Design a binder for this molecule. Sequence first.
Ligand SMILES: COCC[C@H](NC(=O)[C@@H](C)NC(=O)[C@@H](NC(=O)[C@@H](NC(=O)[C@@H](F)CC(C)(C)C)C(C)(C)O)[C@@H](C)c1ccccc1)C(=O)N(C)Cc1ccccc1
Lengths: 127, 126
Amino acid sequence: EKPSPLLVGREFVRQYYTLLNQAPDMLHRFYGKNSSYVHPADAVYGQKEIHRKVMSQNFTNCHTKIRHVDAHATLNDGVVVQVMGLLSNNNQALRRFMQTFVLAPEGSVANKFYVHNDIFRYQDEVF
Amino acid sequence: MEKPSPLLVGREFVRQYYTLLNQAPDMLHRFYGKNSSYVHGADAVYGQKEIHRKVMSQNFTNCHTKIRHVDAHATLNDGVVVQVMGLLSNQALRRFMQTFVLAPEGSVANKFYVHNDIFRYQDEVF
Ligand SMILES: COCC[C@H](NC(=O)[C@@H](C)NC(=O)[C@@H](NC(=O)[C@@H](NC(=O)[C@@H](F)CC(C)(C)C)C(C)(C)O)[C@@H](C)c1ccccc1)C(=O)N(C)Cc1ccccc1
């Protein structure tokens, strides 16, 4: 009675980068109040702030290359997703990245998730 | 005040993990329970026993790490999610990425089990 975590992750990642490229300003409508967002720079928290952060980064004509994506079940019908790839902006240099997300039942509508955590880091910023 | 700091449960976990990796890796199965999935280099083997078996497969001998940064944040049900970025020699350091999810044990707080452990060298992706 249970979607495939693995599948559920690729679907999410697909939705994520389409939307990050199409309209990155309802992007915050993926997260609830108690979410976490990053992209050394501290994470920011909840909708209004995650939304505000997304704006601050002028995401424009945003291209991706998802080179890898694991996902598993985690505590309480959650789903965690590792994702490694290349991301561009203002059609500039593609930079490697390493990403972790937690998806967790939204709970009102069944089999609908929300992003409790979205940790993203460029290898060139850390390595 | 009611729950441990996440980052602190995060940065101390990594400490215990990769240390216990250079030290006896025939102990890591301690860290896990019977809902726990382990995924190194790739479908997850569950439980202390298979994960142990999987650990041992890897002949972790004089494992050398080098953490470059760590994110640990709070997730549902007082869980701590943890993305690690570093280099792992086990021999040339190999850029890597390890995601964890730490879940409250239940009986007592400040006490957690590793529900999840997903590893990928980068030079295998890309
Ligand atoms: C019969 O044996 C009996 C089972 C037994 N297993 C466990 O408790 C498992 C199920 N769990 C662990 O080991 C976890 N350990 C802890 O939660 C410990 N807490 C702490 O030191 C810190 F959280 C303290 C604070 C950071 C909150 C200020 C503690 C004291 C044991 O509660 C690890 C996975 C973890 C997870 C997140 C952050 C750090 C460490 C166990 O064997 N040990 C505790 C010993 C051991 C040795 C070596 C490796 C693992 C376990």
